[PDB]
Design a binder for these strands. Sequence first.
RNA 1: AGGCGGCCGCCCCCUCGCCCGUCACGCACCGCACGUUCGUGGGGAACCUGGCGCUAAACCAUUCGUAGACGACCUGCUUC
RNA 2: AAAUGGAUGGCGCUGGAGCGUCGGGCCCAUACCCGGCCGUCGCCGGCCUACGCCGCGACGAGUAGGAGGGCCGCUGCGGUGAGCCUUGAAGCCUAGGGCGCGGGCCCGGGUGGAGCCGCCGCAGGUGCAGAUCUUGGUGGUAGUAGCAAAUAUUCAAACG
Lengths: 195, 153, 148, 50, 129, 109
Amino acid sequence: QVLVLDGRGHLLGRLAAIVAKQVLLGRKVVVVRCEGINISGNFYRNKLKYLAFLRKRMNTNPSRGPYHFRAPSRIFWRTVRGMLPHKTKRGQAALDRLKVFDGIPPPYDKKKRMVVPAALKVVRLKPTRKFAYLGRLAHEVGWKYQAVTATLEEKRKEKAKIHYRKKKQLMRLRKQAEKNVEKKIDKYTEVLKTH
Amino acid sequence: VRYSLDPENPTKSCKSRGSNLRVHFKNTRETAQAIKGMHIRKATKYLKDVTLQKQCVPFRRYNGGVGRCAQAKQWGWTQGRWPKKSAEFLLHMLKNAESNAELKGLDVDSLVIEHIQVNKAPKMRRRTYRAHGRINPYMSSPCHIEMILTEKE
Amino acid sequence: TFKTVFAEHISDECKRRFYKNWHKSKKKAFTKYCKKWQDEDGKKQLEKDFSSMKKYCQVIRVIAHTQMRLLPLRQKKAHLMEIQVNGGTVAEKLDWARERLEQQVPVNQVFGQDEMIDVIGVTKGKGYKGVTSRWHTKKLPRKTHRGL
Amino acid sequence: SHRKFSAPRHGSLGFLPRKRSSRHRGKVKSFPKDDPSKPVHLTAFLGYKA
Amino acid sequence: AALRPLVKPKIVKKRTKKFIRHQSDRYVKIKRNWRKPRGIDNRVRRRFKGQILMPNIGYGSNKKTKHMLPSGFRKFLVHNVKELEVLLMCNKSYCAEIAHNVSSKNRKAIVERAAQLAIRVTNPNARLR
Amino acid sequence: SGRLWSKAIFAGYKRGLRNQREHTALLKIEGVYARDETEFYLGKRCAYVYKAKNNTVTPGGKPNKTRVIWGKVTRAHGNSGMVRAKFRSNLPAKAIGHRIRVMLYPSRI
RNA sequence: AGGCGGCCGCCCCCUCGCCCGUCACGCACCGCACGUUCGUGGGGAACCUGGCGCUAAACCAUUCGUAGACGACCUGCUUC
RNA sequence: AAAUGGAUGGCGCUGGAGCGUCGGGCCCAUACCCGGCCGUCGCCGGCCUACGCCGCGACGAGUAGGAGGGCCGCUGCGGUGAGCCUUGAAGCCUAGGGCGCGGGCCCGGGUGGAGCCGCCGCAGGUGCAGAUCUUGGUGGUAGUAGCAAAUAUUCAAACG
Ligand SMILES: [Mg+2]
Ligand SMILES: [Mg+2]
Ligand SMILES: [Mg+2]
Ligand SMILES: [Mg+2]
Ligand SMILES: [Mg+2]
Ligand SMILES: [Mg+2]
Ligand SMILES: [Mg+2]
Ligand SMILES: [Mg+2]
Ligand SMILES: [Mg+2]
Ligand SMILES: [Mg+2]
Ligand SMILES: [Mg+2]
Ligand SMILES: [Mg+2]
Ligand SMILES: [Mg+2]
Ligand SMILES: [Mg+2]
Ligand SMILES: [Mg+2]
Ligand SMILES: [Mg+2]
Ligand SMILES: [Mg+2]
Ligand SMILES: [Mg+2]
Ligand SMILES: [Mg+2]
Ligand SMILES: [Mg+2]
Ligand SMILES: [Mg+2]
Ligand SMILES: [Mg+2]
């Protein structure tokens, strides 16, 4: 059904390729933590290309024409727009199925986030090559919401710690229960047939 | 004679017609669309308000270059105009339909206007006198008007 | 906007602001809201709203209006204003606002003399005017057919 | 081309979306910033040009 | 269950569109009958993809399934009793079809003679009282 | 009780770059992601389940609003493990990005 | 961009709420598909019943000028 | 280093989705092979409309142009159907059924009220999408421009 994807440590084009392929099949995919999506190359080059993209505008009326979003979620949504056939009611329905968010929403705090191995910085890039941060680029050009998103991100990280301590306590309790006795009769079946 | 959209029964229905009457076809079409779907006393009070310029007729289809008015907001529309002569002729044919319902013997206080129809009659031509000695037509646009009324139950 | 908490005794000028036709209106605004003020069980559901207001908000704006009875005007409608309190912490800002509900704020209380304070308003209506009066462009000479 | 007398441009592009404002009371687009060092005060009042 | 003719296979027509004329949609002075365009720049004559198709020899139906009604007979029109009784020998493959200008008084006699001779008529219950 | 059909997503038609061929359809079937994995599904029969407001149904007890265009698997397609299929009637092209059942009959278990 | 989860004290009750063994039946519809699902699916018009309640507001008209080509905007209308 | 903002097609891409060398798979064109159907040509069969009936094989694109066929069509003429009918002909309409590849045709349903068609031959003022085509009618424009040269009208009553 829903595919909640991490954005921490992913690449823009690779993640956009996998999302734009999997959204045409019907799986409702949502890319969360979009401010952490890395872009290869130099950061001066990335902001120079984005400055050229801002320079591209209609001269007779800039409103009727090129729109230039500054938020990184809308940057990734434009990246998936430029790959889906959005002028037809296949890519238009796919962009209606696609949802993108900066930070993490409260349902996606609770729901588990997936990590795509094919789009990772470590898998795809040589570790001695330069990179950038899409949230850093967005804060440098236009998107003035880094200080609020980072504060709410630290808040949900504190929430995640105070949940993970309870989860690890319950895991220690259930492994004490597994350490206890009189469960091995089924384990004679299970260890033979793939414990 | 025949009428388009014959009613459910001729017992509880009256009918009226005007033929070859000097009006504007577009104004009579728009005031007929403003009339249609209304009780007969409300339509009579509405046409009196049109002749007194207290409640307008919205122009929806034939709406080219027509100035706005504040009174069109009852109709959910922006443009409007107050056809005096069209309101007078259609009120006269509503009085004729009222008299025909009285002749047929209906409950005359509970009639609604189920069907109305307006179409272009044969027009009469005069001539203008434009520049360079040229003659251009100056043509009318009369209309045939039909209406089928129905009791409300 | 987290939630808006109004006062108890709301003036007739504010009611004329909330309504369009004061003659046709039956003057029925805030009857149930004043009932929520009057009821004892409604106070606990109202003081809890300030407890959440102390916790989650940072920008608190106080709504104020004008007394039209002290004016020689004819409008008799009180214009509402959100005024952002730029004071200290949210707790004492909320305590200040709840202490000074339904009270008057003079200009000598907040402002002062020789304080450089900007003015925001709406310009005059000059109507649908032309180009040389709007953009102050240069006029064409006398010999110009079709417009100067 | 080569206009031969370069003139400064009439008007301003920053005031270009000219419209009868839907509000008639001039609203505040941006209030000044806050800090807990300053005491509690207000920022904006109403007035009438007498 | 009327007369049940002989072995008639799955009748195919290889396309069933009765091809439209080019730009008959745009102008209502143009009848929908086909007419071969002989223009020097026309996309239909040049046979571009996405355009209309021209009727040629390839759309010919099979000779076994040629002039075949979906009931399984081949039609033959009839005016009177002699042209009905000429179908006495081949009534199991060739059906009758009464002409439009035949009145009801003779039409009932023709359909009664067809019911006696076991000849299929395409319009048995038409123009009756 | 329980699902007996494998899940497949209708991906598109057999096409080049410009023109299409609507007689053969493409199915991205779940689980299969390899040429060696799209071997067991050779010979399966597919079914596209859709809805309509009239009543043309199976004899399964009661009439409903369910209509199915039938068909079956023809062959494999690509190295990614896609499945070609020729249905008895061609696809309505509304089924793009939707689901077609693959039921586990006549294959060679 | 929140609505389900956790604790305490009782309630109409249940010790077959689950795995291992014995027993007998329920449509066994006699070769066939769309069957079993989060569905007490989304919203729209009405039908009869229980309790708790609700008793208005826009637009036109008129006036006003801080506004106006026409629309549009800001306004007044109580019997003190 | 060049003038509107813009082009490996764009999105993007750096352990490649760049570069050069290559391996195995994979995708399709009206190309190839097999098969079903139509037509042409060639060779041929039979003493079954001989101008008909089969059999085999290879081939089909095309402006200007040239031929063959048309049981495509319109008007009229002579033979011809013991033709059609006021119990409804020509004409016109049709979300009806069908045929032929196509020219077109047949039937059903609705108005109409007096002429019409099929085969074989014969003769044409014989087929329209154009020609700033001719005649006639009708839309968008459009309830738009325009009812502005020469100082000015106002109140009451009357026939109506
Ligand atoms: Mg216009
Ligand atoms: Mg106008
Ligand atoms: Mg003149
Ligand atoms: Mg003015
Ligand atoms: Mg001049
Ligand atoms: Mg702002
Ligand atoms: Mg050419
Ligand atoms: Mg580029
Ligand atoms: Mg390479
Ligand atoms: Mg050829
Ligand atoms: Mg003929
Ligand atoms: Mg000629
Ligand atoms: Mg002649
Ligand atoms: Mg013509
Ligand atoms: Mg031509
Ligand atoms: Mg011409
Ligand atoms: Mg004209
Ligand atoms: Mg005018
Ligand atoms: Mg004008
Ligand atoms: Mg004059
Ligand atoms: Mg008088
Ligand atoms: Mg009188």
